[model samples]
Target: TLSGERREIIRRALNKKILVPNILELMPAWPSEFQPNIDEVNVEIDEWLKTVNVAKEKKLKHRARGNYTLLAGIYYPHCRKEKMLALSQFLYWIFFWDDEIDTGGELTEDREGTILCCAETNKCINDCLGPEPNYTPPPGSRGTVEMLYPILRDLRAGLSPVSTMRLKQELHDYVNGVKNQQKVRQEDHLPNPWDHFQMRVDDVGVIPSITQNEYAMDFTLPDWIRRHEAMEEIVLQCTKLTILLNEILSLQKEFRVSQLENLCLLFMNTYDMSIEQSIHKVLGLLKDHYKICIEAEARLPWSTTDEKLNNNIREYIRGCQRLATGTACWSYNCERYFKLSQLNDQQELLLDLSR
Candidate 1:
């Protein structure tokens, strides 16, 4: 048994802390020009939910969990109506996939099963993304590729060929990243700090997901511009900061499931620090990366000669800032992280179909 002092320490670590100075305010504020149409997005979600076969409880849970409508509102504040609907659908689909693969599902218990399903699903998606038009999965397919068909069609209709291909690549990377996590889980493994950071960067799919925000705004960033060191750095820092915030907020929730992944736990395991101390260190990293994001934004390449292209690049930069602030706000306010009850020391969801 732990001593009284150690038990107290554990209690403090389990209880969430009150953050100082409201970190969301430290980042740039959402731009005033982009307005969010929450009601419209919600309506779109309701309609889309009808065609799908997920349990009503699962659908309701998703509504509470991620609030993709709200996320889309913030991330694509300037998007047109159809574009908003498409992006919102995209967010909803991704979150649903996460719930199935990560949080609770049959495949969660079987690493090899998860890998097989994701690989086959990715192939179907890749087929739709190719040069051919109107691609569809084979008649018997029932995984994510089939579910993503209508969603991809909507997005493809709205994006340039280049943008569509970029989205496909990101989606592929995200699937592989999750497979990596599954392998670790099967081995009961925890990644080192550096590997943990690198894995989360790709696993979350934030870079490609956020990059697609530009498509909703009807702009395609050239490959050269996206590959620039400065742009890469900015996106990397943003991904790091966002993932860190997510890990910190969900730390207790993740712990209940015996999850040993995430930066805080990695730091604790690697450095022999208490959970509270590790959390503070993660917060410090968030602040440092936020500062780097600001600096990187200023140094983003621009060309005065190509006036139109420069304006597009500027808008993309603005979109990156919005991605950070918008995600920050979402993570803080979403019921998924904040409002759920922990019963029997387990975080409760509306439903857990996996069991």
Candidate 2:
């Protein structure tokens, strides 16, 4: 509904004067699955948030930019329905964290505050996964502690020790990147283009998010397989493509506030490229990375690992592809980014910033 309202508003508000470059083709036509229980799950999550005292805050607020659970459905299409509920709740929770960071006044302006919040989050996630796998929220703990404690606890069910380890490391990286980006934004100058690109990849949170696919799909690779060169490359390329695509789609929304931290502004500001040239440059990288992901996927050393283990690698790579494509498919239509009635190709989005 939030996306629906914005789409209509932006459609009528369209300005014919400022057209931005378009390249919707890179987001390939991939068949994706949407959870049948999306509506029921969302309602339960809403009630869950309220029970945890998030009823009146931004944390429970809906973006309506499509629904966050759709990303869960599309990306983890193979997750069993029961696992899918826990998985979808995780997605919904993450977007709350994302909204806090992006809303600027919330966590964006307060670097130390954001750092402490992330520190608590990072610590809590593992603490919930005690040596026994059951969780106990500390005595007199804030209600918010109970919020993620149970969801993550359930999501961690049946996960391998290796899977759990990877999840911790990936999540740790995500928040650190979030803090680093916060650090850079408060500075007077923009970060180096290359550096910002890398930071955004880490900040995207897709790494840990995809690791959840292991839990959902009932697969896990030993540490050695995960660290293999070929598998590593598959993840690298997937992260790059997803983060860059996010920047491209977020152009209209982020441009209104001129977030210099976004890829387009970082490229345009640091590389001396015009906005149009900057968009095109990132689009090229998006195309190239998608090509790299498949190449690396094909290069996996199936000979070394057992066939069953090899399938785990195959599923993970497939999960990454679904994430990248599903994000594009959903993002293109979501009010989280552009809300125009029709996204005509190569058209300038000189439409929203005037506000």
Candidate 3:
């Protein structure tokens, strides 16, 4: 039930137009080397993808289209074979769950259904993240979590209890954020820009994704170091950068869906800014936060006096950088956002405003 005022806000935002002019130019191409092992990494991931009995067509669809291996290869570039495959598998799981909640998908406008699904998944993933882990499948429903449980179990492998708790909480926050996002979309009202920004960061699926950096990079910071204020600051900046880049890349797709959580559309509707202005604002914010991420890492909680511990911390931070840059680079080619044909010669980056 969109109120009349809410209807106008959405209508005004929909007509807004923008462009992503060579995103690599946004920075000095942070991770200068692109790895080719994505080809090998993807093959191993596909074997598991098939074995798990994931939804048939979408698995192949995503494999060819999304190619998260390429992205995750960029993400944990230092992560060789097995861990890299695991990271990409989790990313594929993220895409599968995320795609199910938007646009024409099952849960987009069905608030009760989304709420119920979120509960099932939260409880389901919670169950998997336990000792003697056993996942109770949703009754006759092989949804994202049920089929993805084995991967979750594998992800849980070789983790300290505290690391498990951190991942569990991050994943919980992500599902809850999706639940709230669907609830708000079903209610059909644009949120305050600031509020949307806060929720959008989590709902964009960066929270849990970032938390897996340790698992992917094969390193764990000390529990106290992980819990430090400086660590929190670094995480926030990475999440912020992820959210902004995603919005910039997915603007047309989200705009066409009338995705109310998108910062690009929210600024247009709320601040009365044009789409270009909103993108500029987001880009400027992205640049500032990237600098801020640098600053935060410069002020880590631990010192080089213990090179071993400090090396571990530095590796973890590098994964944070990997997440930010990997997402930016992969968004250009992935079928989730653009057609290779429509882009310039670069095989780079939008929307039907379908294809």
Candidate 4:
């Protein structure tokens, strides 16, 4: 349970009103019609689990369903039905993979096993991206690798070459981030805040998911605009803000699990502060980045100031906004953060101190 001071800080931070950036205020409205394609997404995941020979026990299926539903709701509220389903499938694959590596699964305490999984996963992704006629999963490969083939096939068929390459790079970086975390675990070293932030920037796959906002809407940003220096800053800012927010929402659960790589824990350990201090520090970090994103969005210069190009750029920015806001809304409501036993009709910033 939280100490008196810890509880006070948490209450203050939870009550501190978070405001959407001014730029997002002017962006396109979130689709009121958007809802999770839960039935479809769950069916696809069942097929995936069956193909991989994962046991279809009741508890496992229930958890998988909740995960997919949350992803469909949070990540793509602005997406159409078909697009949302596609994104949801990819998310299901990613979350399952992450759970295996990070939690009490096959690779949880086995650093060498985790590294081998990463190497094999990387090879599987390369195979999917290659020009091979019939994709084959390598012998001894895990379900996560096998799951990649179908997702990649559908994505490659739909996305433009430039967008596909961007996603591949993001996936590669994500694997590298996981590999680094494994090394840290093997060495029994706790990373400083700076290092944690850097690793997390790559480790947070949501940043890459922003690339799909275009693909989800059947649009694409040309190479030039996507690679622009201004666009890179905006992406970084969006990614950082979202990661920090996630840490705030999930810190209690993470603490329960003794996960030390999280932002709050890192700050608390590094500075020798109380949990309350770290929570305040983390929230301050979020507030600062939120402001920076607003400034960065205002400063983006359109290619040639062309009206059409400018409109495309603004839409792309709007997509990023959706990711940030959509995820925050879901975190507030999702059972993943607040277990059903504790949740009420009205969503609140809950502090669950008892396991």
Candidate 2: pairs in clash: 18-350, 19-348, 20-347, 20-348, 20-349
Give the residue spans of candidate 1 off by over 4 A: 1-12, 15-21, 29-34, 184-189, 340-355
Could you report the Cα RMSD, in angstroms, for every candidate shown?
5.7, 6.3, 3.1, 5.5
Pick by lDDT: which candidate is best? 3
TM-score of 1: 0.85
TM-score of predicted structure 4: 0.81
> Which residue pairs come into collision in candidate 3?
none
Residue 246, candidate 4: Cα error in Å is 1.4
Residue pairs in candidate 4 whose N, alpha carbon or C atoms collide under 3 angstroms: none
- Compute each candidate's TM-score over C-alphas: 0.85, 0.83, 0.87, 0.81
Candidate closer to the true structure by lDDT (higher is better), 2 or 3? 3
Q: Residue 249 lDDT in model 2?
A: 72
* Top candidate (TM-score): 3
Clashing residue pairs in all predictions, respectively, total 0, 5, 0, 0
Over the stretch 26-117, how does candidate 2's per-residue lDDT look in tens digits?
64544566667766667765666556544465553453654677677778777777777778767766676666666464767786768777
lDDT, candidate 2, at 318: 82
